[PDB]
Structure 1
């Protein structure tokens, strides 16, 4: 049932949201990062300084070695391992067990995160971007093929400001997790969860770029990336606008590069001097769109380091990209996001843990209409 799946996620945007899974027979329990931005299921399978536990293949009587190796480089971080198959379950997900491909990670570089409390990654996107190639069936494809679970899942990621980290509902939509309307944008191509941004405003001001620039060379929805990542041209305009709005305050060298912290005395963060970002997503009807609005409570990411805890400190959670737009975890937070694979669309609604203060709130609003008939997609 959906209610049994509520609050089955832990973690945070900075180190990742994870769900409990089991692999092997008898079941070995591992925490697994939920990643809509890739398509490999992989688990630590040998000792590593940052691993609290790992998958022990020799103790699973249902493990089968595929006798093939695999290497996966992400935007940052990489791992290598041996491919196999084994039985997999999600204790607080659907009440099923399936046989799935699993990469046993034996070497890695800047992949595992110290103190993150996860030991593997669940790539929920499509086969086209699976490694070594699209012939390696992703987990969710196996789940749907082997069970009666409907072909969709939804994510409610919740920030620290608004333990439980959120919900992954597999097989359906849980109405108790959102309010207002659910607005859908088409999945442009089934590889990443690729979508199209048709307009960007910062504090109500249109960036007035050719909309193809917003999607150079693709835009994706990616729970495994912390930040909003923007193409160079768009990033520069966004930073310029946010700087101009917040110009009553002077920020450190390196803050805007996402590297350096800014801190305020407890409770005094000047949210009001930072603008809202509106991303308008292509709608299901020609030249209609809807917008999701992003508050600074989202794109200024709090750090929870004990050493800095006397004050409220943040990193700038918007980064320059050379591989297209990424709507990462800080964007997904506060929204209920429905990955409707069956109907090739992604839905957004205001979530029960939505971000707001007394003056402003994250929102999903529509429809908007545009006169220009240009296809905002970068590729056909």
Structure 2
């Protein structure tokens, strides 16, 4: 249960989430569970499905307790429905503890489970305010903290790592071997999603020049369950215009910028240097101070592994328009060590031990930056 024994406890397939091994029930039933900072329900496949290798069999668990209540969660992509109950849960490569937690037993779903993803359930790590059916359903992490001495903090090192990816979820603390340089903290604005505030956006150091509330219209969040960086429409359009300008020595079809169509180069020849760096400036812990996190094209051009196209390297543009605020998804978290410091209501970013670099540019977390304008960047 030591932090070192938690290193490398995550696996995934690119664009399909990262998952940790758990057990549910007595005796323990092993399942792989997607780690989601963008939701707050713990839910597991509990009936057969074409894409599930295995599923939770409540009838084999003596500790299962039925709560006699249904529950439905509609995600941005995918949805499921099922029955609530509680059971014992453990994380074999997490802390050394067993807790009783709410579990939604999924009995019907649509476009939620993913063919070949290797996971069978979801661990929503965000706060009760966004749990279904309502905020009286205590989330898993709340139960863990209440029932054990685990400190109220976890960290995620998602590695873009050949379709297979890895990383680490450190429960209850911060493992200094997983990052270099300083950790910079941004405040959690409200405990529902992991809501943060972006104060500035640059593309190859050119400010997008918008009122900073636009960046957080109508919230900005850190979400390991969404793949892409998602940007409010107005911000999205300004960003795409600036990235197109920076990369204009090559022209790509509209479908590529819509994040729908692949772009392919002969293997080993991807022209990284024509694509700009994106800087996201996060509110700091002191008034009108910020820090920035810098994203390279190796993070926002997501490779799509496919043997059939493997004479080439092919990528999707991993930035999408949103109508529900900014989503700093997995492609933004990859190569940073991200500390979800619930105890101190803040989120820490540092350059990860698995960072993106090439011979010219390196992903960075740096600061402080000061801004003269006294405007509050929070929208809501």
Deviations 1:19-62 (A, max 9, x none): 00000000000000000000000000001010110000000010
1:11 match: secondary structure: strand
Q: Deviations over 1:192-244 (max 9, x none)?
A: 00000000000100000000000000000000000000000000000000111
- By how many angstroms is 1:252 displaced? 2.5
CA pair 259-133 structure 1, distance change in 2 beyond 3 A: same
Contact 1:43 1:104 in 2 (8 A): yes
Q: Distance in 1 between matches of 2:44 and 2:162?
A: 30
Asked whether the equivalents of residues 39 and 125 of structure 1 are also in contact (C-alpha less than 8 Å), the reply is yes
TM-score of the two chains, using structure 1 as the length reference = 0.99
Query: How many pairs does the alignment contain?
Result: 379
Deviation sequence 1:321-380 (CA, Å, 0-9, x none): 00000000000000000000000000000000000111101000100000001110002x
Taking the aligned partners of 1:158 and 1:310, their CA distance within structure 2 comes to 25
Q: CA deviation at 1:161?
A: 8.7
The question of whether the paired residues in 1 share the 8 Å contact of 2:155 and 2:339 is answered with yes
Contact in 1 for aligned 2:264/2:312 (Cα 8 Å) = yes
**Does the aligned pair in 1 maintain the 2:13–2:117 contact within 8 Å?**
no
Q: Distance in 2 between matches of 1:16 and 1:141?
A: 22
What is the Cα deviation at residue 163 of structure 1? 6.2
Report the Cα offset of residue 310 of structure 1: 2.0
Larger mean Cα displacement after TM superposition, 8-17 or 370-379: 8-17
Q: CA deviation at 1:139?
A: 0.1
Cα contact 2:37–2:224 (8 A) shared by 1: yes
- Which is worse superposed, 305-314 or 186-195? 305-314
For residues 162 and 113 of structure 1, do their structure 2 counterparts lie closer, same or farther at Cα, with a shift above 3 Å needed?
Answer: closer
- Change beyond 3 A, Cα 1:217–1:164: closer
Alpha carbons 1:182, 1:349 under 8 Å: kept: yes
Counterparts of residues 197-216 of structure 1 (less than 5 Å): 197-216=198-217
**Aligned with 1:98: secondary structure?**
strand
Residues 223 and 329 in structure 1, CA contact (< 8 A), matched pair in contact too? yes
Question: Compared with structure 1, are the counterparts of its residues 243 and 163 closer, same or farther at alpha carbon in structure 2 (3 Å cutoff)?
Answer: closer
Q: Secondary structure at the match of 2:248?
A: coil
> Matched residues in 1 for 2:306 and 2:91: separation?
30
Distance in 1 (CA, whole Å) between partners of 2:346 and 2:228 is 22
* 1:13 Cα offset (Å): 4.2
Which residue of structure 1 lines up, in the alignment, with residue 289 of structure 2?
288
Q: Normalising by structure 2, what TM-score?
A: 0.99
Paired residues of 2:338 and 2:348 also in contact (CA < 8 A):
yes
Three-state SS of the structure 2 residue aligned to 1:214 is helix
Contact 2:13 2:164 in 1 (8 A): no
Contact 1:298-1:330 within 8 A present in 2 as well = yes
| Structure 1 unmatched ranges of 5 or more | none
Residues 161, 233 of structure 1: alpha-carbon distance in 2 compared, 3 angstrom cutoff: farther
What is the 5 A alignment of 1:262-341?
262-341=263-342
CA shift for structure 1 position 307: 1.8
Q: Determine helix, strand or coil for the equivalent of 1:254.
A: helix
Residues 56 and 39 from structure 1, CA distance in 2 versus in 1: closer, same or farther, beyond 3 angstroms?
Answer: same
Match of 1:284, SS?
coil
Structure 1 residues 299 and 161: CA distance shift in structure 2, 3 A: farther
Q: For residues 233 and 288 of structure 1, do their structure 2 counterparts lie closer, same or farther at Cα, with a shift above 3 Å needed? A: same
Partner deviation per Cα, 1:164-194 (whole Å, 9 max, x = no partner): 6000000000000000000000000000000
Shift in Å, 1:162 = 12
- Give the deviation of 1:304 after TM superposition: 1.3
- Provide the C-alpha distance between the structure 1 equivalents of 2:86 and 2:160, rounded to a whole number of angstroms: 34
Give the distance between the partners of 2:162 and 2:217, measured in 1 at CA. 32
- Distance change (3 Å), C-alpha of 1:370 and 1:36: same
Is the 8 Å Cα contact of residues 290 and 369 (structure 2) preserved in structure 1? yes
Quote the residue 2:252 is aligned against: 251
Q: Deviations over 1:135-166 (max 9, x none)?
A: 00000000000000000000000003996600
Over aligned residues, Cα RMSD in angstroms?
1.1
Please say if residues 100 and 143 of structure 2, whose CA atoms lie closer than 8 Å, have aligned partners that are also in contact.
Answer: yes
Deviation, 1:76, is 1.1
Runs of 4+ in 1 over 4 A off after TM superposition: 161-164
TM-superposition CA deviations, 1:78-133 (whole Å, max 9, x none): 00000000000000000000000000000001000000000000000000000000
